[PDB]
């Protein structure tokens, strides 16, 4: 048998159609991720990605941060998450400015308006996710 064939029946493209690259599991999961999901607007793509990253970003600061052994450990973790998210959304905005200089199409991540909607979604979502993880970690004794 042969589970490694040319990518899209093109032997001269620099890729291989391995199980990892071209399996139905990989295709399903990637195509269903928000950045690839069909029908999602750029705002919702950014929103889902933002909440996703903001929920987990608080944790390293909370437990491994300098004030882990302090009564305000989770507060400092949330503030650190907000700062890191501010840096990340600044990076997103400058990336959009540098890449999609001249664009008018919109409704597309590869355009200025679409990337701006995506960045707004990411920023709000990540702030909300950091706050939500703060709220859950305050009341973790519930579970």
């Amino acid at each position: 048998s042969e589970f490694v064939k040319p990518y899209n029946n093109d032997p001269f493209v620099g890729n291989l159609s391995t199980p990892v690259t071209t399996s139905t599991a990989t295709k399903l999961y990637l195509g269903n991720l928000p950045i690839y999901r069909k029908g999602l607007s750029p705002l919702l793509r950014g929103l889902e990605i933002g909440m996703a990253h903001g929920y987990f970003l608080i944790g390293p600061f909370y437990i491994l941060g300098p004030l882990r052994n302090s009564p305000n450990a989770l507060l400092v973790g949330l503030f650190s998450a907000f700062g890191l998210i501010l840096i990340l959304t600044l990076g997103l905005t400058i990336y959009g400015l540098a890449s999609f200089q001249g664009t008018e199409g919109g409704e597309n991540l590869e355009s200025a308006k679409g990337w701006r909607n995506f960045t707004s979604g990411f920023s709000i979502g990540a702030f909300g996710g950091a706050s939500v993880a703060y709220v859950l970690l305050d009341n973790i004794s519930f579970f």
Binding site: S41, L43, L47, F142
Partner: protein, 144 residues
């Protein structure tokens, strides 16, 4: 503005007209429904409708939040937050852009009651009762 349910045109102060209305009518529906459930729970709890349990026996609405904040109200927070998250996914995808949706129609008509001939009756009763329950709950909370 005009062309919506309960349009008395009661708008002396300026809030929305060529804009915002997609959000404003839907927020009025959400606030109204919240008010109906809030006032109904307040009256039921004050009347005597209670969960079966030792902790719930003594609590009476106003004195109940602080004790029921951490365990059961947190589960309520989780459920409400999930439903509001899918609601936000539907909502932000409408108002910021111009995709087609109606204000407050989350598609929650599982019994197909809007197929009744008197569907404008519901699209009127909902808003009126939300407003009335809002004015009611403002009173019941500001008495105490």
């Amino acid at each position: 503005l005009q062309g919506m349910v309960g349009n008395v045109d009661f708008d002396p102060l300026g809030l929305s007209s060529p804009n915002n209305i997609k959000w404003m009518r839907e927020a009025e529906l959400k606030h109204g429904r919240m008010s109906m459930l809030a006032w109904t729970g307040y009256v039921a709890v004050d009347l005597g409708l209670r969960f079966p349990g030792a902790r719930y026996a003594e609590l009476n609405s106003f004195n109940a939040h602080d004790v029921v904040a951490k365990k059961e109200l947190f589960l309520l927070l989780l459920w409400v937050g999930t439903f509001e998250t899918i609601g936000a996914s539907q909502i932000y995808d409408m108002s910021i852009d111009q995709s087609e949706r109606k204000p407050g129609d989350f598609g929650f008509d599982p019994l197909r009651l809007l197929k009744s001939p008197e569907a404008p009756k519901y699209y009127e009763a909902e808003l009126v009762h939300g407003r009335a329950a809002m004015l009611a709950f403002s009173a019941v909370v500001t008495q105490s």
